[PDB]
Design an enzyme around this catalytic site. Structure first.
Site, PDB file in Angstrom:
ATOM      1  N   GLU A   1      -7.543   8.607   6.117  1.00 27.57           N
ATOM      2  CA  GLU A   1      -7.803   9.296   7.396  1.00 27.57           C
ATOM      3  C   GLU A   1      -8.378  10.705   7.220  1.00 27.57           C
ATOM      4  O   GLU A   1      -7.793  11.680   7.716  1.00 27.57           O
ATOM      5  CB  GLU A   1      -6.563   9.329   8.288  1.00 27.57           C
ATOM      6  CG  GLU A   1      -6.015   7.901   8.591  1.00 27.57           C
ATOM      7  CD  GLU A   1      -4.910   7.892   9.627  1.00 27.57           C
ATOM      8  OE1 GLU A   1      -4.398   8.979   9.990  1.00 27.57           O
ATOM      9  OE2 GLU A   1      -4.582   6.780  10.134  1.00 27.57           O
TER      10      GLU A   1
ATOM     11  N   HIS B   1      -2.948  10.952   0.464  1.00 26.32           N
ATOM     12  CA  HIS B   1      -2.397  10.763   1.788  1.00 26.32           C
ATOM     13  C   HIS B   1      -1.733  12.054   2.246  1.00 26.32           C
ATOM     14  O   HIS B   1      -0.593  12.036   2.716  1.00 26.32           O
ATOM     15  CB  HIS B   1      -1.403   9.582   1.793  1.00 26.32           C
ATOM     16  CG  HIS B   1      -1.207   8.954   3.149  1.00 26.32           C
ATOM     17  ND1 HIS B   1      -1.348   7.594   3.364  1.00 26.32           N
ATOM     18  CD2 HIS B   1      -0.847   9.487   4.342  1.00 26.32           C
ATOM     19  CE1 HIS B   1      -1.053   7.319   4.623  1.00 26.32           C
ATOM     20  NE2 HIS B   1      -0.745   8.447   5.241  1.00 26.32           N
TER      21      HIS B   1
ATOM     22  N   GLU C   1      -3.682  -0.134   8.058  1.00 24.70           N
ATOM     23  CA  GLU C   1      -2.523   0.202   8.870  1.00 24.70           C
ATOM     24  C   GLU C   1      -2.699  -0.365  10.267  1.00 24.70           C
ATOM     25  O   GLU C   1      -3.787  -0.276  10.831  1.00 24.70           O
ATOM     26  CB  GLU C   1      -2.369   1.708   9.065  1.00 24.70           C
ATOM     27  CG  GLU C   1      -1.987   2.498   7.817  1.00 24.70           C
ATOM     28  CD  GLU C   1      -1.809   3.987   8.076  1.00 24.70           C
ATOM     29  OE1 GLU C   1      -1.458   4.380   9.207  1.00 24.70           O
ATOM     30  OE2 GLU C   1      -1.994   4.764   7.121  1.00 24.70           O
TER      31      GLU C   1
ATOM     32  N   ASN D   1      -7.643   1.773   9.815  1.00 22.75           N
ATOM     33  CA  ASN D   1      -6.373   1.859  10.519  1.00 22.75           C
ATOM     34  C   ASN D   1      -6.656   1.775  12.000  1.00 22.75           C
ATOM     35  O   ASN D   1      -7.681   2.251  12.448  1.00 22.75           O
ATOM     36  CB  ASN D   1      -5.668   3.202  10.232  1.00 22.75           C
ATOM     37  CG  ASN D   1      -5.285   3.373   8.772  1.00 22.75           C
ATOM     38  OD1 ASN D   1      -5.318   2.438   7.976  1.00 22.75           O
ATOM     39  ND2 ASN D   1      -4.898   4.592   8.420  1.00 22.75           N
TER      40      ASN D   1
ATOM     41  N   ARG E   1       0.852  -1.175   0.000  1.00 25.91           N
ATOM     42  CA  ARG E   1       0.000   0.000   0.000  1.00 25.91           C
ATOM     43  C   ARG E   1       0.901   1.242   0.000  1.00 25.91           C
ATOM     44  O   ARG E   1       1.716   1.442   0.915  1.00 25.91           O
ATOM     45  CB  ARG E   1      -0.949   0.021   1.209  1.00 25.91           C
ATOM     46  CG  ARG E   1      -1.728   1.340   1.340  1.00 25.91           C
ATOM     47  CD  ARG E   1      -2.790   1.360   2.470  1.00 25.91           C
ATOM     48  NE  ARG E   1      -3.400   2.692   2.511  1.00 25.91           N
ATOM     49  CZ  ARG E   1      -3.385   3.522   3.555  1.00 25.91           C
ATOM     50  NH1 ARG E   1      -2.881   3.144   4.726  1.00 25.91           N
ATOM     51  NH2 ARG E   1      -3.903   4.759   3.418  1.00 25.91           N
TER      52      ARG E   1
ATOM     53  N   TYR F   1      -4.318   1.736  15.936  1.00 23.76           N
ATOM     54  CA  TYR F   1      -3.086   1.747  16.735  1.00 23.76           C
ATOM     55  C   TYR F   1      -3.330   1.644  18.244  1.00 23.76           C
ATOM     56  O   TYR F   1      -2.558   1.005  18.967  1.00 23.76           O
ATOM     57  CB  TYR F   1      -2.304   3.063  16.500  1.00 23.76           C
ATOM     58  CG  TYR F   1      -1.766   3.168  15.106  1.00 23.76           C
ATOM     59  CD1 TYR F   1      -2.540   3.689  14.072  1.00 23.76           C
ATOM     60  CD2 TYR F   1      -0.497   2.693  14.814  1.00 23.76           C
ATOM     61  CE1 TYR F   1      -2.047   3.746  12.762  1.00 23.76           C
ATOM     62  CE2 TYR F   1       0.012   2.757  13.539  1.00 23.76           C
ATOM     63  CZ  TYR F   1      -0.765   3.286  12.517  1.00 23.76           C
ATOM     64  OH  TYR F   1      -0.219   3.337  11.282  1.00 23.76           O
TER      65      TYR F   1
HETATM   66  O1  LIG Z   1       0.938   8.120  13.263  1.00 27.94           O
HETATM   67  C1  LIG Z   1       1.186   6.897  12.532  1.00 27.94           C
HETATM   68  C2  LIG Z   1       0.421   6.824  11.219  1.00 27.94           C
HETATM   69  C3  LIG Z   1      -1.079   7.049  11.455  1.00 27.94           C
HETATM   70  N1  LIG Z   1      -1.796   6.916  10.192  1.00 27.94           N
HETATM   71  C4  LIG Z   1      -1.328   7.707   9.038  1.00 27.94           C
HETATM   72  O2  LIG Z   1      -1.938   7.205   7.860  1.00 27.94           O
HETATM   73  C5  LIG Z   1       0.177   7.573   8.855  1.00 27.94           C
HETATM   74  O3  LIG Z   1       0.573   8.504   7.852  1.00 27.94           O
HETATM   75  C6  LIG Z   1       0.908   7.844  10.164  1.00 27.94           C
HETATM   76  O4  LIG Z   1       2.311   7.727   9.955  1.00 27.94           O
END
Ligand SMILES: OC[C@H]1CN[C@H](O)[C@@H](O)[C@@H]1O
Length: 438
Positions: free
Chosen positions: A164, A119, A344, A288, A75, A290
């Site tokens: 995002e 992006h 992600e 995504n 990607r 985290y």
């Molecule tokens: O902060 C980490 C990632 C969070 N998501 C975004 O797409 C990416 O560009 C960032 O690096």
């Protein structure tokens, strides 16, 4: 063991401004991230995307790393101003050439390209005309998207309109922490709405131009848990910060209830006039993920985070693997998209090259293993997860944090541009080869 479905797409992910460098090479126009990072005070240590990982020159080596690791999908994003230096009108053949070589190389090597159209590196020329605040960006974005589909759609069959869009709108135009660095809530909600309109026009163009491919859109998401019994504060954060802000319009033709309660005054007066068009059918949802956050009612949006004694990454983000299972379950339950990808997932840790020449990132392995296991769970329970992408292939320019945060499964020594595959990359290669965990 935890085996994934046959043909499951294991990938890695990057973004153009974060890795490429050479932002003004070969006739490219400035982006808003060029001008933002070149403004003192906006990025830690005064870091910029001028050089980054020099992927603009080292792209072949990097793809050879993807190949060597056996990773099945890549990607990556396209820089809009490399393609149309003034945003609309003139097309830059050298910019098309750069991505054409990457695409052909991936296909030659049996790696599936997933292209992120946007992006965050908006052409600076379009920012001068209001950028995401201007309704006309639906047209500019459709024109851009059409150029990509016409030039690349013969070979690339998996497309993402926006990465995002919550971050683009809110962090760029309300918090002012990202380009274009504004703090106006009315602009921020206009940007939300125009991102949806532009996304939908691009999908519309896609149906006219690439009759055999698939297109979707990517959202950031957090796992918000309540501090007590502000379970509504969790409800608001989910609806505002997660996929519902955009998917409620796409699938249901209006913003989520609690978003409207908070932000109605900030949306255009006649915003519903655009909802029928916003419902343009999409092929997959990219999520995504985290981090998790403990939330309580409180604060500008009536919400504040409560710190918890949980392990954290170098970002200070709490590690909550069950969050990835939750968000996958929740998206099926709420909107039932036909396909989902984790576009992600990853972690920043303070990586060091040991004397043995290796990067012993057990912390990152543990992070990825836990999240992959939770994704597997979601699959067992009927979520149509088709792929999973690790952020990121390479340590890179982490936006306002600059180079101080390393998310790669491959270490980049910025003094030499040497790539060193981390223990996490080796570990992931085995996961991919095995099609799962053991
Ligand atoms: O902060 C980490 C990632 C969070 N998501 C975004 O797409 C990416 O560009 C960032 O690096």
């Amino acid at each position: 063991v935890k085996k994934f479905p046959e043909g499951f797409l294991w990938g890695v992910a990057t973004a153009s401004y974060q890795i490429e460098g050479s932002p003004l090479a070969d006739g490219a126009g400035m982006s808003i991230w060029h001008t933002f990072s070149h403004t003192p005070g906006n990025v830690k240590n005064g870091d910029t995307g001028d050089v980054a990982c020099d992927h603009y020159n080292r792209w072949k080596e990097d793809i050879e790393i993807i190949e060597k690791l056996g990773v099945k999908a890549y990607r990556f994003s396209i820089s809009w101003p490399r393609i149309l230096p003034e945003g609309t009108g003139r097309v830059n053949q050298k910019g098309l050439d750069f991505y054409n070589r990457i695409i052909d190389t991936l296909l030659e090597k049996g790696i599936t390209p997933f292209v992120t159209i946007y992006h965050w590196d908006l052409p600076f020329a379009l920012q001068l005309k209001g950028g995401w605040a201007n309704r006309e960006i639906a047209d500019w974005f459709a024109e851009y998207s059409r150029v990509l589909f016409e030039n690349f759609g013969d070979r690339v069959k998996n497309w993402i309109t926006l990465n995002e869009p919550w971050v683009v709108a809110i962090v760029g135009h309300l918090y002012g922490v990202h380009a274009p660095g504004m703090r106006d809530i009315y602009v921020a909600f206009r940007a939300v709405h125009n991102l949806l309109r532009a996304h939908a026009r691009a999908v519309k163009v896609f149906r006219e131009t690439v009759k055999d491919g698939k297109i979707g859109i990517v959202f950031n998401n957090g796992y918000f848990e309540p501090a007590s019994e502000d379970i509504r504060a969790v409800r608001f954060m989910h609806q505002f910060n997660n996929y519902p802000l955009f998917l409620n319009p796409i699938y249901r033709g209006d913003y989520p209830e609690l978003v409207l309660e908070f932000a109605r005054e900030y949306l255009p007066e006649n915003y519903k006039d655009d909802m029928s068009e916003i419902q343009e059918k999409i092929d997959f949802v990219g999520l995504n993920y985290y981090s998790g956050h403990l939330v309580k009612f409180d604060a500008p949006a009536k919400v504040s985070f409560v710190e918890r004694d949980l392990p954290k990454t170098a970002m200070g983000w709490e590690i909550v693997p069950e969050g990835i299972y939750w968000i996958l379950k929740k998206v099926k339950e709420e909107y039932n998209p036909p396909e989902v990808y984790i576009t992600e997932n990853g972690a920043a840790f303070d990586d060091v090259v040991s004397e043995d020449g290796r990067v012993h990132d057990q912390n990152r392995i543990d992070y990825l293993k836990a999240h992959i296991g939770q994704a597997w769970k979601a699959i067992q329970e009927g979520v149509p997860l088709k792929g999973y992408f690790v952020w990121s292939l390479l340590d890179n320019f982490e936006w306002a944090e600059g180079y101080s945060k390393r998310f790669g499964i491959v270490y980049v020594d910025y003094s030499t541009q040497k790539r060193i595959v981390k223990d996490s990359g080796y570990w992931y290669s085995n996961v991919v080869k095995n099609n799962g965990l053991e």
